[PDB]
Amino acid sequence: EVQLVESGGGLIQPGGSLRLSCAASGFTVSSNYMSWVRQAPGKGLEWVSVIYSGGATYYADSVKGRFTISRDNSKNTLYLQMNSLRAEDTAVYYCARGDVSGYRYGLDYWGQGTLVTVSGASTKGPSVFPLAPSSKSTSGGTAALGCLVKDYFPEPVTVSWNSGALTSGVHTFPAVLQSSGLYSLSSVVTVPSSSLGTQTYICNVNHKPSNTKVDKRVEPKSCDR
Amino acid sequence: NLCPFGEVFNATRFASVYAWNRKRISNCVADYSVLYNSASFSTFKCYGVSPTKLNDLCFTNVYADSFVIRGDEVRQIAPGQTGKIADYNYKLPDDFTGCVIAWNSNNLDSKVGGNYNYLYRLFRKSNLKPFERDISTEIYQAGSTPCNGVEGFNCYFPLQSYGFQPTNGVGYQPYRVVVLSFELLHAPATVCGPK
Amino acid sequence: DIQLTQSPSSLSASVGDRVTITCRASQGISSYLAWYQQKPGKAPKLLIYAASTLQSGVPSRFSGSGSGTDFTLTISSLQPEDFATYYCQQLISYPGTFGQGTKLEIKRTVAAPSVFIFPPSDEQLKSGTASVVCLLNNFYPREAKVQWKVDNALQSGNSQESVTEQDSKDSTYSLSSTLTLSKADYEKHKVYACEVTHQGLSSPVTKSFNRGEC
Ligand SMILES: *[C@@H]1O[C@H](CO)[C@@H](O)[C@H](O)[C@H]1NC(C)=O
């Protein structure tokens, strides 16, 4: 089973430096062609760099002189040292197995990606509020409930329900950028109204840039005003 | 007795770069000016020697290495280069003394639907030493599990065909290459110019 | 340098339809081409390499053809889970240029949204802000209008909306709209409503609540 896991992405001010890591398992990094590819938000794909098993390295013209690809054989890990970062370097960076020149196989395995945001703004952790089910447990049908994840920077946040046990009927909406420069997002789920008094619903929100982790229980609203 | 450059430069078939051909030339007169001034060669670059001074020098042995690569790889056939060809197929030393001659061969080495006869080594754990010729066809182990001679997941066939099609862009077309190496040992010089 | 022109930029097709995506290279690149499929929030997935070889695990409805300059990716019978952005990539030289991408959406029967309104939580009201949320669940087509009304005055300039990507199973969309007010402004009004207009609704649907549960 092949696994590629990127880390080291996050907020960095213009002119700053970041080092990305890609821990691999299921193949030997030092024996393969290994690449970095990036994707700016809402844009297409761009190959950034490659390292050969023998040691040769190649770069896209847009990152030449600023980026350095390397690896650690003993850790089976790939690295991307990124210096003098600019706003146009903001992207999800992916590590992938393969090369893109005289390499018919293409890039067969990719990691999940790590988002790099090049901005002078400050990090802010979100506030998490419940979106309580309106429907009473006795009104035979479907109830909607959710969480509102408000005022965070930068992206991304992850949302799961009941620690991953609840996936059916879940909709986690893309974040919207508010006029305050902070992001806001909602995550909802539809469940049988009969299950409102019998199953507990908790949204698990993770905002790694601020080390924020919130588990918000979503209960039906009480008569107490 | 002229040097048999005609059988090197005008050979009907050329070797694949991974299995590059070496022809040892000796005890003959060589007019390198007819080669340096020829219109049939798009590349003629000399290192450690002046091309217009070849006819006046003497060497113990001359080697003529020949193979086919893409046009955009001819730049790797030089000292201090990196790439799939320089690293894994044909490596020149930093102190190279000789000449690199190349010419487009799309008319001979490409065919409709692809010419898959010409191969290059894609997978190799480390770089070749100068003038090393690796002809291994052993399955390349890209993971921790042994391959047992079976091509599959993490077990690659180390050689790849170029697949030259006549429609390829010029940099991806086949180029025939001849590398002349000049050696001078503590033995008499058997290869000389017309003096 | 090689230019890769991928077409069309977007495509809408019904389940069961045959879909073809084209990629044209400016110079002949033999079979040095790959096709990738990228789903929302996921990394690209290799479908085909060497222009026509299926990657292990890829369904038989995907196939690639072409050599030289013109390449095609075909889905012989489109499935709901095939909603994705598809990319071609040249693999003959650096920088391994990817095509612009083709956004493939699924055509499907009209489905009216289920509408829900959520008042601000008491926890948020303690902080001085009130966010009112309106959810439109599982609808088709994407085009839907949400009109916020506060004591019957139509609100504009103080709401933001978000739409999910098309669902991989039923090909519907969901939409969330948030109306944001200060706690002081929130307490000046009684009726909060969101009126939804959609192709699947014969007349607009309104969900509402009275502040303080009246
Ligand atoms: C190759 O053939 C042509 C035509 O016969 C001849 O003029 C040329 O000198 C030959 N090349 C060499 C290096 O002898």
Side-chain angles (χ1 to χ4, degrees), chain A residues 1-2 26-33 50-58 71 97-106 108-109, chain B residues 70 76 82-84 87-88 116 120-127 140-144 151 153-154 156-157 159-164:
Chain A
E1 151 78 342
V2 174
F27 67 83
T28 306
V29 165
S30 69
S31 300
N32 283 269
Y33 287 91
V50 70
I51 183 162
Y52 284 27
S53 55
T57 60
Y58 301 95
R71 64 184 186 223
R97 197 261 296 268
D99 182 44
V100 307
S101 169
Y103 198 87
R104 277 187 195 93
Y105 304 99
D108 61 344
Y109 289 96
Chain B
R70 275 156 57 152
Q76 294 181 44
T82 71
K84 295 180 179 64
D87 299 353
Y88 312 141
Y116 301 89
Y120 64 94
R121 183 173 309 277
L122 181 61
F123 299 105
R124 205 181 194 267
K125 298 272 167 55
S126 64
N127 295 351
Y140 186 86
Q141 187 187 319
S144 65
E151 181 168 1
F153 172 69
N154 280 354
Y156 292 90
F157 193 74
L159 308 178
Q160 302 290 310
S161 359
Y162 273 111
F164 298 119

Side-chain angles (χ1 to χ4, degrees), chain A residues 39 45 47 50 52 94 99-105 107 110-111 132 171 173-174 176-178 186 190 216 225, chain C residues 32 36 38 43 49-50 87 89 91-95 98 118 123 137-138 160-164 174 176 213:
Chain A
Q39 179 162 49
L45 296 155
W47 168 90
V50 70
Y52 284 27
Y94 299 101
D99 182 44
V100 307
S101 169
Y103 198 87
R104 277 187 195 93
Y105 304 99
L107 306 169
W110 297 62
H171 292 294
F173 291 89
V176 299
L177 185 59
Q178 310 169 100
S186 55
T190 51
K216 181 64 57 159
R225 299 265 78 88
Chain C
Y32 291 91
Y36 300 85
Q38 187 181 33
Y49 65 86
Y87 293 96
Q89 188 197 12
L91 299 164
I92 200 161
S93 60
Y94 295 116
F98 287 85
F118 297 98
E123 183 183 4
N137 213 45
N138 306 340
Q160 292 193 280
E161 73 181 34
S162 197
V163 184
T164 59
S174 286
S176 179
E213 198 174 317

Side-chain angles (χ1 to χ4, degrees), chain C residues 60-79:
Chain C
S60 66
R61 65 184 176 274
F62 291 91
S63 68
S65 69
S67 205
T69 60
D70 296 349
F71 303 89
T72 308
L73 171 67
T74 304
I75 304 178
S76 53
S77 177
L78 187 62
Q79 296 302 298

Side-chain angles (χ1 to χ4, degrees), chain B residues 6-24:
Chain B
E7 61 178 305
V8 176
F9 286 96
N10 286 334
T12 298
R13 304 165 192 85
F14 262 49
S16 279
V17 62
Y18 83 93
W20 51 268
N21 231 276
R22 169 158 285 189
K23 170 82 174 166
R24 187 183 169 109

Side-chain angles (χ1 to χ4, degrees), chain B residues 3-11 34-35 38 40-41:
Chain B
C3 287
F5 290 128
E7 61 178 305
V8 176
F9 286 96
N10 286 334
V34 85
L35 307 167
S38 173
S40 55
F41 311 132

